[PDB]
């Protein structure tokens, strides 16, 4: 029947970007009219696909990826970009066929004096390859000095909280993000437009 996207966009609570969530939509019909005629969204950047032509199309599988970041960082939910998120938490390929959406969530994800439940990963030995996901808490050895325990400026915790406060500024206020990825394979196309 209807493809379950309201369970993805209307989730009571989302996840941290380093631990990003993927939900696969399959064998169903969807009107994206909920999505694109909306006006409640900050970010609506589509790649390889007109979002207005989505109901006239069929795909083999659809992947809804959801997470939370700041607004200064959405730019990074984009093809071919760099920085803390793109390089170490969530990567989009240059060959992205899909759409990316976000909106302010300062009313759901912030707390007076800091909401710490949202974390991003500060560093990795290498850059995350497309669609990769990393949840490791391995003490990061900055100083190239043997690391045991956890110590100082030379051994570091790789994750950082966002400390969301409602009184923060918009680029520092919370944004829920949904990456909708649309795939055509050499097999049957279940996920289609209403018409």
């Amino acid at each position: 029947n209807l493809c379950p996207f309201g369970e993805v966009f209307n989730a009571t609570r989302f996840a941290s970007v380093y631990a990003w969530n993927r939900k696969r939509i399959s064998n169903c019909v969807a009107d994206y009219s909920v999505l694109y005629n909306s006006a409640s969204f900050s970010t609506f950047k589509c790649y390889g696909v007109s979002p207005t032509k989505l109901n006239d199309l069929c795909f083999t599988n659809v992947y809804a990826d959801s997470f939370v970041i700041r607004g200064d960082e959405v730019r990074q939910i984009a093809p071919g970009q760099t920085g803390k998120i793109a390089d170490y938490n969530y990567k989009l390929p240059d060959d992205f066929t899909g759409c990316v959406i976000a909106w302010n969530s300062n009313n759901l994800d912030s707390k007076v004096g800091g909401n710490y439940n949202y974390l991003y990963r500060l560093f990795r030995k290498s850059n995350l390859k497309p669609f990769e996901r990393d949840i490791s808490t391995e003490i990061y050895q900055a100083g190239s000095t043997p690391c045991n325990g956890v110590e100082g400026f030379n051994c570091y915790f790789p994750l950082q909280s966002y400390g969301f406060q409602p009184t923060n500024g918009v680029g520092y206020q919370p944004y829920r993000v949904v990456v909708l990825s649309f795939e055509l394979l050499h097999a049957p196309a279940t996920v289609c437009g209403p018409k």
Epitope: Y116, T137, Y156, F157, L159, Q160, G163
Partner: nanobody, 130 residues
Framework: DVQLQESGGGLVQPGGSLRLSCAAS????????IGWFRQAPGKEREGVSC????????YYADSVKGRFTTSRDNAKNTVYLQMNSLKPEDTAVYYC???????????????????????WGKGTQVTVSS
């Protein structure tokens, strides 16, 4: 709405001492960290000291150890750096920064990252010569 003013710094000679000072504004945070950073000429930014807000816990960069120390007077919301046996390579523009602490699973960690702090300040200059 967090503002920070670093104060202190001048020409000091070798073996010398100076004491720096951050000014803290708007922290409304419950668990935070304040860092001292420095950027020498033509080199990258480096961290000198971190203090936790909960207990005042502190860490230091290796070379800085034994000489520089960090304290807090909660009242003026100021954080300091007692610089004490100055050397020429300690010449730099020194910096304040603020950061949220991180609470993974109720295990508290505080990280002062030159790559990653939320709030920063203009800077203070410390020169060490004869």
């Amino acid at each position: 709405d967090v503002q920070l003013q670093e104060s202190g710094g001048g020409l000091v000679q070798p073996g010398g001492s100076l004491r720096l000072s951050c000014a803290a504004s708007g922290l409304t945070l419950d668990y935070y960290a304040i860092g001292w950073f420095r950027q020498a000429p033509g080199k990258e930014r480096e961290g000198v000291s971190c203090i936790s807000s909960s207990d005042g816990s502190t860490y230091y960069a290796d070379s800085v150890k034994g000489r520089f120390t960090t304290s807090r007077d909660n009242a003026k919301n100021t954080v300091y750096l007692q610089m004490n046996s100055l050397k020429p390579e300690d010449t730099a523009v020194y910096y304040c920064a603020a950061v949220p602490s991180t609470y993974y699973s109720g295990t508290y960690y505080y990280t002062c990252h030159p790559g990653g702090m939320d709030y920063w300040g203009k800077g203070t200059q410390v020169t060490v010569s004869s």
